[PDB]
DNA sequence: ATTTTACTAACTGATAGCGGAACTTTGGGACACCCACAGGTTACGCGAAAATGGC
């Protein structure tokens, strides 16, 4: 019953900070591409620079 | 008696190994705020076959 009990909670905790990380990571791709948008031509493509 | 040769020991060079310090190399970090891109293009032409549209 303890460990079940402590699994449960480790998991909803992993799922909640998962999911606030994921809402920040998707507001702040419009940031992540104004900033590459300046190294293009240098060898890679525009979309290995997003990424 | 003399000359040629076979045997042996010492020198030397190559080489594998090691030490160690310098040198190259890899991974992490940086806290004013910054928040949707190019990006040249095309005066082709012709025939087929494949995909859309019409009622």
Redesign the pocket.
């Given at each position: 019953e303890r460990i079940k009990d402590i699994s449960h909670r480790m998991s909803i905790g992993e799922a909640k900070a998962r999911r606030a990380k994921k809402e920040m990571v998707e507001?702040?791709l419009?940031?992540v591409?104004?900033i590459a948008?300046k190294y293009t031509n240098r060898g890679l493509q525009?979309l290995d620079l997003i990424q």
């Open positions: 507001a702040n419009r940031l591409i104004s948008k525009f």
